[PDB]
Design a protein around this nucleic acid. Structure first.
Length: 10
DNA sequence: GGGAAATTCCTC
DNA sequence: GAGGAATTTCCC
């Protein structure tokens, strides 16, 4: 479950 | 269509 | 172990 680098979704 | 903000990943 | 750097998304 590795999530990439980015701003959370709305 | 461009600019600004948040979280996450890697190094020493 | 703690800190710095990189990438992605939303609004007007």
């Amino acid at each position: 479950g590795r999530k990439p680098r980015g701003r959370p979704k709305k």
